[PDB]
């Protein structure tokens, strides 16, 4: 990545480096990567943590962090990828999913969301307050700068 970009990863990394020793820890890794646009799964995050912990020390320096950020990095049109994933659950194929159904699948399949996590999703997704989620508009709003 560009010098400007790496400076951006470094700025983020350094924000979570509590005492300026040039390391963060496994307890900050997910948050830093997310803050920079990554969406690791829970299993992926745990495996990156396991990599760090392989030597029984839980700290991560900047080159190690860049290595983990870059590894199998896969660019796409992210908003579209997410819209497509929602479309899988659009059972009547109409651009909408009910708030109840979205809550159900998000908490009963896969890396299930906690009640706190899904409560926020539904609060953000149903902007017309009508029990329905227009997922294209939801993803647009969540991707805005």
């Amino acid at each position: 990545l560009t010098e400007e970009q790496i400076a951006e990863f470094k700025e983020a990394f350094s924000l979570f480096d509590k005492d300026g020793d040039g390391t963060i820890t496994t307890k900050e890794l997910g948050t830093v990567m997310r803050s920079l646009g990554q969406n690791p799964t829970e299993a992926e995050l745990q495996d990156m943590i396991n990599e760090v912990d392989a030597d029984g020390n839980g700290t991560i320096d900047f080159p190690e962090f860049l290595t983990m950020m870059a590894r199998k990095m896969k660019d796409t049109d992210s908003e579209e990828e997410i819209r497509e994933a929602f479309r899988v659950f659009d059972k009547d194929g109409n651009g909408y999913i009910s708030a109840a159904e979205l809550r159900h699948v998000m908490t009963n399949l896969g890396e299930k969301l906690t009640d706190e996590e899904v409560d926020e999703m539904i609060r953000e997704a149903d902007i017309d307050g009508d029990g329905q989620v227009n997922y294209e508009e939801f993803v647009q709003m969540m991707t805005a700068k």
């Binding site: 803050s35 990554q38 969406n39 799964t41 990828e81 994933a85 998000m106 896969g110 996590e117 969540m142």
Partner: protein
């Protein structure tokens, strides 16, 4: 044997949504999360 088509698609797709939602709450400071100063 394998999952059926829709069940496999749903498994793959819900995990994408979960991971994206967890990332989104950090980026947008939703649900109590705030970046360090």
């Amino acid at each position: 044997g394998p999952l059926g088509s829709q069940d496999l698609l749903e498994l793959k797709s819900v995990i994408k949504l979960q991971a994206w939602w967890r990332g989104t709450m950090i980026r947008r400071e939703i649900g109590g999360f705030k970046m360090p100063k």
